[PDB]
Structure 1
Amino acid sequence: GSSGSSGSSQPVISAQEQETQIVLYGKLVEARQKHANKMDVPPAILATNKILVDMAKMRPTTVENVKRIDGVSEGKAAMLAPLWEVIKHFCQTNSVQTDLFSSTKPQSGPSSG
């Protein structure tokens, strides 16, 4: 047979950001749903809590950062646009910090099409 074990536990999040994540998370969940039916996929199939949670933490505004999220598979993120799309506005209207990733990209001002 085998014997499992338990892992560590992180301390609660400071209301400072915690709150923002709480209010945001709720917004995402709502979107995922209305979007789940559209694609004709179970509210869980579209995006699992694991994904939503991360998105609510990193608060990715660009699909690029979303892809980095855990659980999301390359490309899939795209379809999950309506999700992050809400984060960009939620923070844009509340001047809330976002894209709190480690490996970010500069702004050289691209030009295509």
Structure 2
Amino acid sequence: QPVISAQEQETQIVLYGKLVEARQKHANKMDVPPAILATNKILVDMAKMRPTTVENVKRIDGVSEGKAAMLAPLLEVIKHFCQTNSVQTDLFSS
């Protein structure tokens, strides 16, 4: 019945919270509402699929090329978090 591990489930929740804060942080810097920078739905997808690149984050529903550039600090949060812990990134069919 379950598809992911209990640890994967934890990881996604923890990363999601880091992305929420990162979203609030940068959206402020850029003078955009956080939801305009990235919706919660986009943040969930980023927590599950964990892109670390502009090309990979463009593979997420709702992310354009120019939006990908705006989401760059969030990609940094992902790659660092996954490095510190020991978690696979870029879960795409590549």
Q: Is this a same-fold pair by TM over 0.5?
A: yes
* Alignment partner, residue 41 of structure 1: 32
Alpha-carbon distance, 1:74 to partner: 2.2
Structure 2 distance, partners of 1:78, 1:61, is: 12
Deviations 1:40-90 (Å, cap 9, x if unpaired)?
A: 111211110111010000011111100111111122111110111100000
**Is 1:12 paired with 2:3?**
yes
The change in CA–CA distance for 1:50 and 1:38 in structure 2 (over 3 A counts) is same
More helix by share: 2
Structure 1 distance, partners of 2:2, 2:40, is: 20
Structure 2 distance, partners of 1:73, 1:67, is: 6
Q: How many residues align?
A: 94
Report the TM-score, using the length of structure 1 for normalisation: 0.75
The change in CA–CA distance for 1:96 and 1:73 in structure 2 (over 3 A counts) is same
The aligned runs of 1:97-108 (5 Å cut-off) are 97-101=88-92
Alpha-carbon distance, 1:24 to partner: 0.4
**Larger Rg belongs to:** 1
The change in CA–CA distance for 1:14 and 1:95 in structure 2 (over 3 A counts) is closer
Report the TM-score, using the length of structure 2 for normalisation: 0.89
Q: Is the 8 A contact 1:60 1:87 kept in 2?
A: yes
* Alignment partner, residue 48 of structure 2: 57
Q: What fraction of aligned residue pairs are identical, expressed as a percent?
A: 98
**Is 1:85 paired with 2:61?**
no
Give 3-state SS (helix, strand or coil) of 1:75's partner. Answer: helix
Structure 2 distance, partners of 1:64, 1:17, is: 23
Runs of 4+ with deviation above 3 angstroms: 10-14
